[PDB]
């Protein structure tokens, strides 16, 4: 029993973190086989940050312009190139701790584990969701750039995020491991702002299914709703419209609990219009949206507490 925002064990990733230095700027990089990936802004000094031309700044660097340290071991850079917003530094050694991996570009609403790192040394791990507005609500300080986000399936690490910046509202933005940003953000210190965000409806539903699997049905009701009538309430409360695809994704959870998706939507509509009246769900006083249907199946028992 119980339900926690759970991250994946981080060991397979801790072994790939290194420190990359260019001039007086130091940040984290990811060492897989014979390549080190890191934010291209490592080649910027504070004055380059407002209007950097990376093509121009980079052509002025040589392989030895880059210092790569793995533990207390110096790696030697023997090649470098830019791929969108990342640099790929080829080094003379292959990481012997490289896990099986893949690079994936996750979709909004999906979740992943973040291994916060500083100076190539991992310091903490936590779970988060890619928000609909393409930012994540992480916890990062100066020196955290190059920290990565990932998911683990069996023993394959699927890397999906590299940290690059913080926006004014205190939220974070970054790229997939091909260096393409999530969202309309660019890697320069100009005026940028996260767009308006929305609650991830599919996840709130999944989490209500988790609450039932764990033995709680207080919020259910005798009603049902059409997708359309639900969406009128969703718009009013700034929730993503529910789609038929979302209803299909919730099939397994619905089958495990015996609660039809639209009947659960009716329960949600009621929680939205009436509040929780001093009550909690899985320990929370608010409707949680950072657990996907997959996160629920992963964590909850496959047997409902009837």
């Amino acid at each position: 029993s119980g339900f926690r925002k759970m991250a994946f064990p981080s060991g397979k990733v801790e072994g790939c973190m290194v420190q990359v230095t260019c001039g007086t700027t130091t940040l984290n990089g990811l060492w897989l086989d014979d390549t080190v990936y890191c934010p291209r802004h490592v080649i910027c000094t504070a004055e380059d940050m407002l209007n950097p031309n990376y093509e121009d700044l980079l052509i002025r660097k040589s392989n030895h312009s880059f210092l790569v340290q793995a533990g207390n071991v110096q790696l030697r850079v023997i090649g470098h190139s830019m791929q969108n917003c990342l640099l790929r530094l080829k080094v003379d050694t292959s990481n012997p701790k490289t896990p099986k991996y893949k690079f994936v570009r996750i979709q909004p609403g999906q979740t992943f584990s973040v291994l916060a790192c500083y100076n190539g040394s991992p310091s903490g791990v936590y779970q988060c969701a890619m928000r609909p507005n393409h930012t994540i609500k992480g916890s990062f300080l100066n020196g955290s750039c190059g920290s990565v986000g990932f998911n683990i399936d069996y023993d394959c690490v699927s890397f999906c995020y590299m940290h690059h910046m913080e926006l004014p509202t205190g939220v974070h933005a970054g790229t997939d491991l091909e260096g393409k940003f999530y969202g309309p953000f660019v890697d320069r210190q100009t005026a940028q702002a996260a767009g308006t965000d929305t609650t991830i409806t599919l996840n709130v539903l999944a989490w209500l299914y988790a609450a039932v699997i764990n033995g709680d049905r207080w919020f259910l009701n005798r009603f049902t709703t059409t997708l359309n009538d639900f969406n009128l309430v969703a718009m009013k409360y700034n929730y993503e419209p529910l789609t038929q695809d979302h209803v299909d994704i919730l099939g397994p959870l619905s089958a495990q609990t015996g609660i039809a998706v639209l009947d659960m939507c009716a329960a949600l509509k009621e929680l939205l219009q009436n509040g929780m009246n001093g009550r909690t769900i899985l320990g929370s006083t608010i409707l949680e949206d950072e657990f996907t249907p997959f996160d629920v199946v992963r964590q909850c028992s496959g047997v409902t507490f009837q």
Binding site: P39, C145, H164, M165, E166, L167, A173, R188, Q189, A191
Partner: peptide, 5 residues
């Protein structure tokens, strides 16, 4: 105001 980490 984007701040690069």
């Amino acid at each position: 105001x984007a701040v690069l980490x």
